[PDB]
């Protein structure tokens, strides 16, 4: 047909393609092949002049689908996406004088979650800046597809820069971006335990940028392995110091192996016993009376704490709960911890 | 082969079990001309760290050895001075020994020997030896940092030289072991004196170096306020790491008046979301305290008035996102009215929206 050949001929191409647009209201692979063989972020992202580039030739298709009979013309762009995958995220770019991104769902249903993931991976590989400036709206318009698994989170953190991580934490702290949910955050961090160094630091900073209380994720302490997981251990230590210790947190801290090169437990216990002395004493007393966390593990962690607390002026082993618990407990492993029991005896 | 002299040193050369053979030389270099030691140390230098399992029964395997005996013979030292010339010439020939001594000092008594060795040119000696150690063996530098910072606080807390040295090569696991050492009372790398200047200097380092510096600072117990003036120096595009860490740590603070002064005293850029983020956080958890501080700042107790007003208008335009009665607090409305009364007519229509919150009902 000769109008489509006129569009081929010109290459102010908007009305020229509106010719085809008007004609596709009653064998499209050749049209989409022509369109594909025919064919992102402005350097200064200024509002309403970033849409200066959003016009142009191909994006006009998007426009004609943003206006019932709203269904008999997305087949063309479905064939475009089946030919050229990149347009899949270009649409997202266009959608962010459009209405709302509720069009993209309708576009996805011709291949939502796997479409979003592939388009976002292509965007990540090609243009990182576009992925940054697209992440908030993506996570907002599609929460039940993006908050469930660290796929998209890993995608972002694998390529993100420190300045891009700063703009992302800002977006989180401003009410514009939400990347975790109290449901999935634990699963997602246990998954994150396998990522690169800076990827894991980015994940943890982004989690702190939300307002999810530490306890929701303190079970992760089970999974934190001395040799294997430095970043999550460091962030969890530096955040746990700032918390009033619950009994479950001190159980989780004591339920980690005693390795002579592992300084997490004794560090956090020293901090707690110096600022929350009687509360920590109460919790470890309640733990000592039979609440693996074998008794000798608690005793060894406490003996490490005792041998360390001589560094400072700390009457923590004078607390009445701890001496009460020590004498109650003492009544095989005995010769191992004589000193400890001796603080509650002599 | 090597311009030579005395036969005890020649037996040590012949073997190359060398410990007593070398203490022979040690004892011989007591009643000696101080002219012929450069060739002895040249022989010793042309002659020539951490055990894989660092057990205080296999690190003392390495503290033995032939050269360390010199150190040993000086750790029983009046006549406590007349034998540092030999190792001074060793250091002038082979610099590495400078930190080996430190290693030796970490079944020795106390490290007050190292100063006596340094006086052969303490601070620049420490810095050169620690830089050489950083260059050669990072693992030794890590396992030596605590004692270095402890035995010489006034030499290592003075400038970020040593901190930069460590963070430039450190690993994430070694950064975790260092944060642990800090949190255990064994290592202190900042002090309320220098910490502010030291971080302002750190603002020029690489990404991961700055991340390490900030993590290590949080591992200490220096309150944020002591370093909150650094917000003046933090520039939006250029300093992401310090801004992000400062944001996530300011999140955990009940806002002081100086902290809100420092947050309000940074420029308003439409891509800079630091101030409005932290203000949103504060006004959502401690709304009326933040309002009290902004009232005391607005009645003037640099921060120009329009800067505060623009930051507050950004906060207002953002707070429509959520349910936040922060602009219903009485301190903030009282302050708004006080400001509006003595306000340039320009800023009246400039912030009409803002002032109307304290005017209309």
Residue numbers in the entry:
A (entry chain B): 576 to 586, 593 to 607, 612 to 624, 634 to 661, 667 to 695, 700 to 714, 719 to 898, 917 to 956, ...
B (entry chain A): 571 to 586, 593 to 624, 634 to 662, 667 to 695, 700 to 714, 719 to 898, 917 to 976
From the paper:
A complex composed of Integrator subunit 3 (Ints3), single-stranded DNA-binding protein 1 (SSB1), and SSB-interacting protein 1 (SSBIP1) is required for efficient homologous recombination-dependent repair of double-strand breaks (DSBs) and ataxia-telangiectasia mutated (ATM)-dependent signaling pathways. Ints3 has an N-terminal and a C-terminal domain connected by a linker region. Ints3 also binds 30-mer random ssDNA and does not bind dsRNA, dsDNA, or DNA/RNA hybrid. Both nucleic acid binding and Ints6 binding properties were attributed to the Ints3 C-terminal domain. Here, we present the crystal structure of the Ints3 C-terminal domain, uncovering a HEAT-repeat superhelical fold.
Finally, in situ proteolysis was used to screen crystals, by adding a trace amount of trypsin in the protein sample (1:1000 w/w). The structure of the human Ints3 C-terminal domain reveals an elongated, HEAT-repeat-like, all α-helical structure. Each repeat is composed of an antiparallel α-helical pair or zigzag, referred to as a- and b-helices. Owing to twists between neighboring repeats, the a- and b-helices form a right-handed α-solenoid. Two copies of the molecule are found in the crystallographic asymmetric unit. Analysis by PISA suggested that a 1702.3 Å2 dimeric surface might be stable and present in solution. Because of the twofold rotational symmetry, helix 6b from molecule A stretches out slightly and sits on top of helices 8b/9b from molecule B, and vice versa. Of these, each of two hydrophobic residues, M780/M781 of helix 6b, sticks into a cavity on the surface of the other molecule. Electrostatic surface analysis of the C-terminal domain dimer revealed an extended groove with a strong positively charged potential.
